[PDB]
Ligand binder design. Structure first.
Ligand SMILES: [C]C([C])=[C][C][C]/C([C])=[C]/[C][C]/C([C])=[C]/[C][C]/C([C])=[C]/[C][C]/C([C])=[C]/[C][C]/C([C])=[C]/[C][C]/C([C])=[C]/[C][C]/C([C])=[C]/[C][C]/C([C])=[C]/[C]C1=C([C])C(=O)[C@]23=C(C1=O)C1=C4C56(=[C]2)[C@]2([C])=C35([C]/[C]=C(\[C])[C][C]/[C]=C(\[C])[C][C]/[C]=C(\[C])[C][C]/[C]=C(\[C])[C][C]/[C]=C(\[C])[C][C]/[C]=C(\[C])[C][C]/[C]=C(\[C])[C][C]/[C]=C(\[C])[C][C][C]=C([C])[C])[C@]1(=O)C461=C([C]=[C][C]=[C]1)C2=O
Ligand SMILES: [C]C([C])=[C][C][C]/C([C])=[C]/[C][C]/C([C])=[C]/[C][C]/C([C])=[C]/[C][C]/C([C])=[C]/[C][C]/C([C])=[C]/[C][C]/C([C])=[C]/[C][C]/C([C])=[C]/[C][C]/C([C])=[C]/[C]C1=C([C])C(=O)[C@]23=C(C1=O)C1=C4C56(=[C]2)[C@]2([C])=C35([C]/[C]=C(\[C])[C][C]/[C]=C(\[C])[C][C]/[C]=C(\[C])[C][C]/[C]=C(\[C])[C][C]/[C]=C(\[C])[C][C]/[C]=C(\[C])[C][C]/[C]=C(\[C])[C][C]/[C]=C(\[C])[C][C][C]=C([C])[C])[C@]1(=O)C461=C([C]=[C][C]=[C]1)C2=O
Ligand SMILES: CCCCCCCCCCC(=O)OC[C@H]1O[C@H](O[C@@H]2[C@H](O)[C@@H](O)[C@H](O)[C@@H](O[C@H]3O[C@H](CO[C@H]4O[C@H](CO[C@H]5O[C@H](CO)[C@@H](O)[C@H](O)[C@@H]5O[C@H]5O[C@H](CO)[C@@H](O)[C@H](O)[C@@H]5O)[C@@H](O)[C@H](O)[C@@H]4O)[C@@H](O)[C@H](O)[C@@H]3O)[C@@H]2OP(=O)(O)OC[C@@H](COC(=O)CCCCCCCC[C@H](C)CC)OC(=O)CCCCCCCCCC)[C@@H](O)[C@@H](O)[C@@H]1O
Ligand SMILES: CC(C)=CCC/C(C)=C/CC/C(C)=C\CC/C(C)=C/CC/C(C)=C/CC/C(C)=C/CC/C(C)=C/CC/C(C)=C/CC/C(C)=C/CC1=C(C)C(=O)c2ccccc2C1=O
Ligand SMILES: CCCCCCCCCCCCCCCC(=O)O[C@H](COC(=O)CCCCCCC[C@@H](C)CCCCCCCCC)COP(=O)(O)O[C@H]1[C@H](O)[C@H](O)[C@@H](O)[C@@H](O)[C@@H]1O
Ligand code: HEM
Ligand code: HEM
Ligand SMILES: CCCCCCCCCCCCCC(=O)O[C@H](COC(=O)CCCCCCCCCCC)COP(=O)(O)O
Ligand SMILES: CCCCCCCCCCCCCCCC(=O)O
Ligand code: FES
Ligand code: FES
Lengths: 533, 380, 25, 380, 56
C-alpha cells in the first residue's frame, strides 16, 4: 500500500526524468557539522520569513502619499491628517486580525536578518573562508549585506510616520542633495522634485517589495549554489585534509538538522513578534516637517552611518561660490567602507602574497594580524553604533551629551588602536597556551606533595611518554587542544536511570559498555582513515 | 561496475556502500543508537521526543483557538476591555512561536537520539578540471569563434560593435531619461519672477508688499489650523513655531483652503522658531551683518530647519539660549544670530525679519536673505 | 573653512517700521 | 580516454570530435560557407550583413537624438505644437523598433551566410535510468528511513503527524483569518436600525420621513455637483440619471460636504434612471404587483444598475421603450416594469417610488421594495 | 472599472453559499471599496509574476 505507492511513483518519476544519479549525488553530499557553519542559514531562514510575512503585508498596504483624514478605530489619532501609507499601516495593526503580529514578526525578522549577516560575515573573515577559490562568493555576500541594509531602511520608511520620515529627510534627502555637482540632480531624480513630494513612498514600495528583494534572491541563489558546488571549507582535525570533506551526508542527518533549525529560528522570531513591541507607529504620529522627537535613531544596521554623521566635525569648504557641506564626508566614508569590505580578499592576497587554494580553515588565534584587524574593525563599528545612541545613553546613563560626542570623536581614533594591540597579543597568547599543552600535557588540577616536600601538578599526556615518564612533545596541527580533564572523559557518567530512579544494573552495564565500544570504534575509524591518507 | 544480476543479489547495505563509492563518499563510521534492545532508557527517550512533539501540537491547537476566540479588537484607553486586548498579539506570538519551537526541539532530539551517528568522507575533486575537459571545451569555443569567420570580417565586426553600442546608448538614455529633472528650472511664482524651488519657501513674497503673517498651529485639523499671533502672546523665555500664512489661504473650511493649508504645513522650508529674549539678556545679543534690524525688539525669528541636514532643530533651552537639533546634536547660539557652537553644523540658522502691522499682529518684514535648509553644491 | 557670508556686525540696528502691505494678489 | 601528451598533439578538429563524442554528439555534416575564396559573391554578402548592422546603428543613434531633442510635451487641442507632439511617441517606436530589428536581421543573415552549416546528432539517454543508479538511490532512501527507526516509533510518528497538522492548521487560519469578513454584519444605519451593506443604498431612509431628493449631476466637479429637479425639467421621451441627495450633505464647498457628495457619486447601487414616457403610450403600461403607485403620472424611476451583473444599463430607446445594457445586451421593457425581454438577465430592474414635495421638487416616496443590483445566494 | 464591476465583482458575489464571502474577502467589503487596486497591484507586480517566473 504505502510502500507499493512509493515504488510506483518512484518508477514513474524515473522513467520520465531519469533523475536517479543526480538525486543520489545530492543525497550523498557531505557537510561539516561545525556549529559556526549554521550561521549562514539563520540569515537564509530570516529571509524566507521576511518573504512570507511581506507577501502577507502587501495584501493590505497602500503606499500613497495622498493626504487623508484618519477615520479608523485608534482614538488618539481621530481626525488627524495623514498619508494613505500611514493610514494603512495603522489599519494593518488595528483593523486586520493578526496584522500587528505579522508586522512585528516582519520587523524582528529584518533585525535578525541583518544581525545574522553580520555574525556570519565575522565567521567568514576570521576563519579565512574568503580565500581562493572563494573570493567571488565573499564579494556576493558583501553585496548581499549592502542590499539588506538598504532594503531594511526602505522597508521601515514605508509607513511614513514621524520617526522614519525624519530619517528620510536627513539621510536620503539631505546627504543626497549635498553631493557635489550631481547632488541636487540625484535628489530630483529620486524624489521627482524637492522633498517630500508625492512619488517617494510608492517608488520606495516598488523597490522594497519587488526590485531589491528580487536582486537579493538572485544573489542568494548564486551564493548557495557556489557553496554547494565548491564544497564547504572545514577546520583542521583528525582525518581532515585539503582534498576531502568530513561530516555527514544530506540524507538524512543534515536535512533533519537543517529543517529543525529552521523550525527553531521560526519559533524564536514568532515569540519575539508576540512578546516584544517593535516600531509602534501609532505612538509616533504621521510625518510632518514641522515636528520632531528626541531620539532619532535608525534601525541598528544603519546606526553606524548615523553615528559617523554625529561624530565627524563641521568641516566644510566653500570654493569659488560653491559649497561642499559636512555630509559629503559621510557619503565618501560609506563608499570607502564598502569598497574596503568588498575588496578585502584581494587586499590580503596582495599583502601576504598567499595565492594558494585553501579548503582548510584557520583558527582565528593562528592568524594574529587578521584577527587584530577584524577586532579593530568591530571596535570601530561598535563605537559608531553607540555614538548613534549617544543621546539615549546620555539620558539613561547620566553622561553629558557634549561629552559623549567627544568620547566618540577621540575613541574613533584611539579605541581601534588599543583593540588592535590587545587582540594581536591575545591571539599570540592563545597560541602559547596551546603550545603549553603540547609540551606538557593537560593540567589535571591535582596537586601532589612528594616525600621531600615538592609540590607537583599531575599532567595527562596527549601522546607517548618517556622512560622518565614525561610526554614526548607533540606538534601543533592547527586544531584545538583539550584543556579540561572532564572534556576527555575523566568524570565518567552518573548511572543509568530516570532523574529520580535508577534502571536495573544490568541495563546500565550493557548501555555503558555499548557506549564505550561505539566511541572507541568511531575514534579508530577516524584514526585509520587518517593513517591511510 | 556490477551487473544487473549482481545488483539483484546485493543487500541494502552493500548497495548503499556502492552508491556512496560512485559519488566519492565513504561512510567510515555508522552505528545504531540502541545496540542493546529492550532498555528502559530507550523507552524513556522515545517518550521525551514524543513529549516535545505533543507540546508542539497542543500549542498549535492553542494558536488556532486563541486566533478564533480571543478578543482581538482595539479597546480605547481606560475601557473595560483594554487589558484583554493588550494580550491578543502576545498570545498569538506565544502560541505560534512555542508550537513550531517545540516541533523543532523534538526533531533535533530525534536526530540526536535515534538516527544513527555517522562519519562520512567525500573527496573534493576540486581545482582545475581534468585536461581532457579543459582541452575539449576550449576547442569547442575556439572552433565556434574561428569557424564563424567573424574575426576576419572587419566591416561586419565594426558594424556590429557600433550598432550594438548605438542601440544600447539610445535605449539606456530613453530608459532613464524620464527620471532626469533639472532642479534649477524656474517653477515658483515670486515677486520678481519664477524661481527654482530651492531658492524659495512659503516666506517668499508672491507680489511686492504681500502681507505674510506669522501663524501658529492650533492643533485642530481643519477649522482654522493656523491663526494670527500677537507679540504679547509669547512670554520672555517662550518659543513658538510659526508658519507663513496669508489672508487668502483661509480657515480651511473649503476644499481649496484646506489644500492651501496642507501645502503650508508640509512645506519643508516653512517652519520658523519665534523666541522672546529676556530683556535682561538683550545686551548680550550679537547681530549678524545685514540682519541688524530683523528682530522686533526682544522677538527673534529663525528658521526651524537645521542647516546641517534639515531636521527640525527645535530643542530651545531658554536659559542657555541654545537651540539643539535632536538628529545629530548641533547647537546654535540664539544670542549670536543662531551661529553653530557644537556639532556637525558649520552654518548659522537663517533669520526671518519680522515686524507688526497696523492691527498689532506679527508679520514678516520681507524674506530670508539667504537660502534656508541644508546646503548644496550650488549655494552661496 | 568658515562660510564667507556669515560675519558679526557691530551696527546696532533700528526698530522695524510698521507693516502696511500693498494690494493685488 | 586519451592521455595528457596525446591531447597536446591533437588538432582543434579532433578535440572537437572527442568532446562531442564524450557528450553523445556526432556532427555528421559540417562545411564552410565559402569553399571557393576570392569571389565577388562573398564580398557582396559581407556588405549586405554590414548594411543591415549599419542601419541598426543609425536608427539607434536616431532614437538617442529624437529622445533628446524632439518636442515631447503634450500640446492642447488646436495649438501650434499639437502636430509635432503627436509624432513624439511614434518616432520613439520607429527608431527603437527599427534599430534592434535591423541588428536582429543582420545576425540572422550572418548565421545563414557565414557560420558553417551543420547537422549534429545527439543520442537520447532517456527513459529509465541504468539499474545501478535506480537501485543505489533507492537503497540510499530506504536505508535513511529504515535506519532512522521512525517506522517503529509509533508514539513519535503519531505525535509528529498531529503536531505538524495542528501547527499547520493554526498557521493557515491565522494567515488567512484577517481577510475573512462577514458580508451580513449590520453596519449601515437605517430608519429601522443597522443593516448589512447589500440590503441598502443611498435611497435607504436614515430616519422616518427623511426627504431624499432626486438630484441631477451638473458635471461641475466642485461647486454643486448635484441639484434638485422638477417634473417639467424633462420632456416626454427624455431620460435623466438621478442620485439620492439629502439637503444636509450640501453643495460640496466644505471638505465634509465634498466627501459626502463623493460617497453619493461612488455608491454602486445609487444611480437611478428617471424616464418620462409619452402620454399617448400610458395605456400600454403594465404595473408590477406592489408597485402600482410608484410612478408620478408619466414619470417612472428604475434603478440604473443592471440586475444581471451590475453594469449601468442605460441605453434608453425612447420609441421602443427599451433599456439596453451595454455589457451583455440585456433588454428591459420600460412599459412593463422593466422586466427583461432579451439577454442573460432574468430579473426586472427595481422601481423607485417617486413623488413631489411642497416646493414641486421630485423626491423619493420611500425605498426600493427589493434589493438592487446583481443577485446572490442569500437573495429573495 | 466596468470590466471589474461585472466580472470580478458581479460573478464572484453570485457564487452559491460562499459567493459574497469570497467577494468581501477579495474587496474588503462591497465594490469598489478602497483596497482593491493596491491589492491587485501587489498581485500584479510581484506575486503572480513570481509564480509565473518559477513555472517558466
Ligand atoms: C565589442 C562588442 C562585441 C560589441 C559592443 C556592443 C555594445 C557595447 C552594445 C551596447 C548595448 C547595450 C549594452 C544596451 C543596454 C540597454 C539598456 C541598458 C536597457 C535597459 C535599462 C535597464 C536599467 C534595465 C534593467 C532593469 C532590470 C533590473 C530588468 C530585469 C531583467 C531581467 C532580470 C531579465 C531576466 C531574463 C532571463 C533570466 C531570461 C533567461 C532566458 C533563458 C534562460 C533562456 C534559454 C533557453 C532555455 C532555458 C531552453 O531550454 C530553450 C531555449 C532558450 O532560449 C530555446 C529553445 C528551446 C529551449 C530549449 C530548451 C530552448 C531554450 C534554450 C535556450 C535559449 C537556452 C540558452 C541558455 C544559455 C545560453 C546558457 C548560457 C549560460 C551561461 C554562459 C551562464 C553565464 C553565467 C554568468 C556570468 C552569470 C553572471 C551573472 C551576473 C553578473 C549577476 C547579475 C546580477 C543581477 C543584477 C541580477 C538582478 C536580477 C533581477 C533584477 C531580478 C531577477 C530575479 C530572479 C528571476 C530570481 C532568480 C534567482 C534564482 C536563480 C534563485 C529553445 O528555445 C528551443 C528548444 C527546442 C527547439 C526550439 C527551441 C529547446 O529545447
Ligand atoms: C503525515 C505526516 C508526515 C505529517 C503531517 C503533518 C502536516 C500535514 C502538517 C501541516 C502543517 C502545514 C502544512 C502548515 C502550513 C502553514 C501555512 C499554510 C502557512 C503559510 C500560508 C501561506 C498562504 C503562505 C504561502 C505564501 C507564499 C506564496 C510564500 C512564498 C514562500 C516561498 C516562495 C519560499 C521559497 C523558499 C525557498 C525557495 C528556499 C530554499 C532554501 C534552500 C534551497 C536551501 C538549501 C540549502 C542550500 C542550497 C545549501 O547549499 C546549504 C544549506 C541549505 O539549507 C545549508 C547549509 C549549507 C549549504 C550548504 C550549501 C548549506 C545549504 C544546504 C541546503 C539546505 C540544501 C538543501 C536542499 C535540498 C533538500 C534539496 C531538495 C530537492 C528536492 C527533493 C527537489 C524536489 C522537487 C520538487 C517536487 C519541486 C516541486 C515544486 C512545486 C510543487 C512547484 C510549486 C509552485 C509554486 C506555487 C511556486 C510559487 C512561488 C512563488 C510564490 C514565488 C517564488 C519565485 C522565485 C524565487 C523564482 C524562482 C524561479 C526560478 C528557479 C527561475 C548549509 O546550510 C551548510 C553547508 C555547510 C555547512 C553548514 C551548513 C553547505 O554547504
Ligand atoms: C567635474 C566635477 C568636478 C568639479 C568642477 C566642475 C564644475 C564647476 C563649474 C560650474 C558648475 O558647478 O557647474 C555645474 C552646475 O551647473 C548648474 O549650476 C549653475 C551654477 O554653477 C550654480 O551655482 C547656480 O546656482 C545655477 O543657477 C541657478 O541659480 C541661479 C542663482 O544662483 C546664484 O545666486 C544664489 C543665491 O542668491 C540668490 O538666490 C535666489 C536666486 O534667484 C534668489 O533668492 C535671489 O536672486 C538671490 O540673489 C540676491 O542677490 C543679491 C544679494 O546680494 C541681490 O541682487 C538681491 O538681494 C538678490 O536677492 C547663489 O547661492 C548661487 O551660488 C548663485 O550665485 C539662478 O540665477 C538660475 O536661474 C538657476 O536657478 C547655475 O545653473 P544654470 O545657470 O541653470 O545652468 C548652467 C549649466 C552649467 O554650466 C557649466 O559650467 C556646466 C559644465 C561644467 C560642469 C560639469 C559638466 C560637464 C562635464 C561632462 C558632462 C562630463 C562627461 O548647466 C549645466 O549644464 C549643468 C548640467 C549637469 C552637470 C553634469 C556633470 C557630469 C555628470 C556625470 C558625473 C546646475 O546645473 C548645477 O546643478 C550643476 O552642478
Ligand atoms: C500569520 C502567522 C501566525 C504566522 C506567519 C507565518 C510565518 C511567519 C511562518 C510560518 C511558515 C514557516 C516558516 C514554517 C516552518 C515549518 C518548518 C520549518 C517545519 C519543520 C518541522 C520538522 C523539522 C519536521 C520533520 C521534517 C524534517 C526532519 C526536516 C525536513 C526539512 C524541512 C522541514 C525544511 O524546512 C528544510 C529546509 C531546507 C533544507 C532542508 C529541509 C528539510 O529537509
Ligand atoms: C469556529 C469557526 C472556525 C472553525 C475552524 C476552521 C474554519 C476557519 C478557517 C478560516 C479562519 C477564519 C478566521 C478569521 C476571522 C473570522 O472567522 O471572522 C468572523 C467571521 O465569522 C466566521 O465564523 C468565519 C467563518 C469562515 C467562512 C469561510 C468563507 C468562505 C471563503 C470562500 C472566503 C475566501 C478565503 C480564501 C480562500 C478561497 C479559495 C478559493 C479557490 C467574524 O466576522 P466579522 O467580525 O464580521 O469580520 C472581522 C473583520 O471586521 C476584521 O477586520 C478581521 O478581518 C476579522 O476579525 C474578521 O472576522
Ligand atoms: C544574505 C546574506 C547571506 C546569506 C543568506 C548567506 C548564506 C550562507 C550560507 C548558508 C552559507 C553556507 C553555510 C555556512 O558556512 O554558514 C554561506 C557560505 C558563505 N558565505 Fe554567506 N550568506 C550571506 C552573506 C555573506 C557574507 C556577508 C559573506 C561575507 C562577506 C559571505 C560569504 C560566504 C562565504 C565565503 C561562504 C562559504 C564559506 C565556507 O565554505 O566555509 N556570505 N553563506
Ligand atoms: C530583505 C528583506 C526585507 C527586509 C529586511 C524588510 C524590512 C522591512 C522593514 C523593517 C519594514 C518595516 C516594518 C514595520 O512596519 O514595522 C518593512 C515593511 C514592509 N515590508 Fe518588508 N522587508 C523585506 C522584504 C520584504 C518583501 C519581500 C516584501 C514583500 C513581499 C515586503 C513587504 C513589506 C511591506 C508591504 C511593508 C509595509 C507594511 C508595514 O510596514 O507594515 N518586505 N520591511
Ligand atoms: C517525490 C514523490 C515520490 C517519492 C517516492 C520516490 C522514492 C521512493 C522510490 C524508491 C525507493 C523504494 C524502492 C523502490 O521503489 O525502488 C524502485 C523505485 O526507485 C527507483 O528505482 C527510482 C527512484 C528515484 C526517484 C526519486 C526522486 C526523488 C525522491 C526523493 C523523495 C524523498 C522500484 O523498485 P523495483 O523496480 O520493484 O525493483
Ligand atoms: C582625513 C582628515 C582630514 C582633515 C581635514 C580638516 C578640514 C578643516 C577645514 C575646515 O575649515
Ligand atoms: S539635522 Fe540638525 S544636526 Fe543634523
Ligand atoms: S451587466 Fe447588464 S446585461 Fe450583463
Amino acid at each position: 500500500d504505502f510502500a507499493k505507492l512509493a515504488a510506483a511513483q518512484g518508477d514513474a518519476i524515473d522513467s520520465r526524468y531519469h533523475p536517479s544519479a543526480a538525486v543520489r549525488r545530492q543525497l550523498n553530499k557531505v557537510f561539516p557539522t561545525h556549529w559556526s557553519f549554521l550561521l549562514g542559514e539563520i540569515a537564509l531562514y530570516s529571509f524566507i520569513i521576511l518573504l512570507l510575512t511581506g507577501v502577507w503585508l502587501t495584501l493590505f498596504f497602500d503606499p500613497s502619499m495622498a493626504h487623508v483624514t484618519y477615520d479608523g478605530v485608534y482614538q488618539p489619532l481621530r481626525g488627524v491628517q495623514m498619508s494613505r501609507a500611514y493610514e494603512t499601516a495603522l489599519d494593518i495593526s488595528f483593523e486586520v486580525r493578526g496584522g500587528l503580529f505579522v508586522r512585528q514578526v516582519h520587523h524582528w525578522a529584518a533585525l535578525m536578518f541583518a544581525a545574522s549577516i553580520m555574525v556570519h560575515l565575522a565567521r567568514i573573515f576570521f576563519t579565512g573562508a574568503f580565500r581562493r577559490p572563494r573570493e567571488a562568493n565573499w564579494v556576493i555576500g558583501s553585496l548581499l549585506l549592502i542590499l539588506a541594509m538598504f532594503e531594511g531602511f526602505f522597508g521601515y520608511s514605508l509607513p511614513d510616520d514621524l520617526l522614519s520620515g525624519t530619517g528620510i529627510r536627513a539621510a536620503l534627502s539631505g546627504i543626497t542633495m549635498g553631493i557635489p555637482v550631481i547632488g541636487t540632480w540625484m535628489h530630483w531624480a529620486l524624489f521627482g522634485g524637492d522633498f517630500p513630494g508625492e512619488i517617494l513612498i510608492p517608488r520606495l514600495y516598488a523597490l522594497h517589495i519587488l526590485l531589491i528583494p528580487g536582486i537579493i534572491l538572485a544573489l542568494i541563489g548564486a551564493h548557495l549554489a557556489l557553496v554547494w558546488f565548491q564544497k564547504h571549507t572545514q577546520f583542521p582535525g583528525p582525518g581532515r585534509t585539503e582534498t576531502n570533506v568530513v561530516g555527514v551526508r544530506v540524507m538524512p542527518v543534515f536535512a533533519v538538522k537543517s529543517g529543525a533549525f529552521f523550525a527553531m529560528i521560526t519559533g524564536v522570531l514568532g515569540l519575539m513578534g508576540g512578546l516584544l513591541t517593535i516600531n509602534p507607529i501609532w505612538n509616533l504620529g504621521p510625518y510632518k516637517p514641522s515636528q520632531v522627537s528626541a531620539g532619532s535613531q535608525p534601525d541598528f544596521y544603519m546606526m553606524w552611518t548615523d553615528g559617523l554623521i554625529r561624530l565627524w566635525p563641521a568641516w566644510e569648504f566653500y570654493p569659488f561660490g560653491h559649497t561642499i557641506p559636512q555630509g559629503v564626508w559621510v557619503a565618501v566614508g560609506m563608499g570607502l567602507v564598502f569598497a574596503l569590505l568588498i575588496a578585502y580578499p584581494f587586499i590580503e592576497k596582495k599583502v601576504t602574497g598567499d595565492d594558494a587554494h585553501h579548503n582548510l580553515l584557520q583558527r582565528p588565534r593562528d592568524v594574529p594580524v587578521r584577527t587584530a584587524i577584524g577586532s579593530m574593525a568591530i571596535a570601530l563599528y561598535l563605537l559608531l553604533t553607540f555614538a548613534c545612541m549617544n543621546d539615549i545613553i546620555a539620558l539613561k546613563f547620566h553622561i553629558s551629551l557634549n561629552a559623549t560626542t567627544w568620547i566618540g570623536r577621540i575613541g574613533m581614533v584611539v579605541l581601534p588602536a588599543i583593540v588592535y594591540f590587545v587582540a594581536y597579543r591575545w591571539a599570540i597568547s592563545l597560541q602559547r597556551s596551546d603550545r603549553e599543552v603540547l609540551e606538557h600535557g593537560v593540567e589535571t588540577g591535582i596537586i601532589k606533595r612528594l616525600p621531600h616536600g615538592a609540590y607537583v601538578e599531575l599532567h595527562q599526556p596527549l601522546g607517548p611518554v618517556d622512560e622518565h615518564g614525561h610526554p614526548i612533545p607533540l606538534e601543533y596541527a592547527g586544531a584545538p587542544l583539550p584543556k579540561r580533564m572532564n572534556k576527555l572523559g575523566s568524570g565518567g557518567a552518573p548511572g543509568t536511570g530516570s532523574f529520580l530512579f535508577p534502571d536495573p544494573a544490568v541495563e546500565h552495564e550493557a548501555l555503558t559498555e555499548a557506549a564505550h565500544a561505539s566511541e572507541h570504534k568511531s575514534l579508530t575509524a577516524l584514526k585509520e582513515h587518517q593513517d591511510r591518507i | 561496475q556490477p551487473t544487473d544480476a549482481e545488483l539483484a543479489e546485493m543487500s541494502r547495505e552493500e548497495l548503499v556502500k556502492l552508491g556512496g563509492k560512485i559519488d566519492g563518499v565513504e561512510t567510515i563510521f555508522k552505528e545504531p543508537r540502541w545496540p542493546v534492545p529492550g532498555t528502559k532508557a530507550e523507552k524513556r527517550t522515545e517518550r521525551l521526543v514524543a513529549y516535545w512533539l505533543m507540546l508542539g501540537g497542543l500549542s498549535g491547537l492553542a494558536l488556532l483557538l486563541v486566533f478564533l476566540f480571543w478578543p482581538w479588537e482595539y479597546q480605547p484607553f481606560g475601557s473595560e476591555g483594554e487589558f484583554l486586548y493588550s494580550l491578543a498579539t502576545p498570545l498569538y506570538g506565544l502560541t505560534f512561536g512555542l508550537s513550531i519551537l517545540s516541533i523543532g526541539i523534538g526533531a533535533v532530539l530525534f536526530q540526536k537520539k535515534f538516527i544513527p551517528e555517522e562519519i562520512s568522507v567525500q573527496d573534493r575533486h576540486d581545482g582545475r578540471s581534468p585536461e581532457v575537459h579543459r582541452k575539449t571545451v576550449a576547442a569547442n569555443l575556439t572552433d565556434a569563434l574561428e569557424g564563424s569567420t567573424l574575426k576576419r570580417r572587419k566591416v561586419i565586426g565594426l558594424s556590429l560593435g557600433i550598432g550594438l553600442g548605438a542601440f544600447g546608448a539610445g535605449t539606456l538614455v530613453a530608459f532613464i531619461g524620464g527620471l532626469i529633472k533639472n532642479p534649477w528650472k524656474p517653477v515658483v511664482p515670486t515677486a520678481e519672477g519664477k524661481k527654482a524651488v530651492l531658492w524659495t519657501s512659503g516666506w517668499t513674497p508672491r507680489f511686492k508688499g504681500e502681507t505674510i503673517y506669522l501663524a501658529r498651529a492650533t492643533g485642530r485639523p481643519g477649522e482654522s489650523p493656523f491663526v494670527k499671533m500677537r507679540p504679547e502672546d509669547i512670554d520672555a523665555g517662550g518659543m513658538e513655531t510659526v508658519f507663513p500664512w496669508r489672508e487668502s489661504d483661509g480657515d480651511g473650511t473649503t476644499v481649496e483652503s484646506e489644500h492651501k493649508l496642507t501645502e503650508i504645513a508640509m512645506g519643508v522650508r516653512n517652519p520658523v522658531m519665534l523666541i522672546r529674549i529676556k530683556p535682561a539678556d538683550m545686551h548680550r545679543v550679537i547681530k549678524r551683518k545685514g540682519q541688524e534690524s530683523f528682530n522686533f525688539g526682544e522677538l527673534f525669528a529663525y528658521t526651524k530647519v537645521c542647516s546641517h541636514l534639515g531636521c527640525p532643530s527645535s530643542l530651545y533651552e531658554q536659559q542657555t539660549y541654545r537651540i539643539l537639533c535632536p538628529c545629530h546634536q548641533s547647537q546654535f547660539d540664539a544670542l549670536e544670530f543662531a551661529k553653530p557652537i557644537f556639532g556637525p553644523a558649520a552654518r548659522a540658522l537663517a533669520q526671518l525679519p519680522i515686524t507688526i502691522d497696523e492691527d498689532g499682529y506679527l508679520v514678516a518684514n520681507g524674506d530670508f536673505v539667504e537660502p534656508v535648509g541644508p546646503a548644496f553644491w550650488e549655494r552661496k | 573653512c568658515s562660510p564667507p557670508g556669515e560675519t558679526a556686525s557691530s551696527e546696532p540696528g533700528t526698530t522695524p517700521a510698521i507693516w502696511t502691505g500693498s494690494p493685488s494678489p
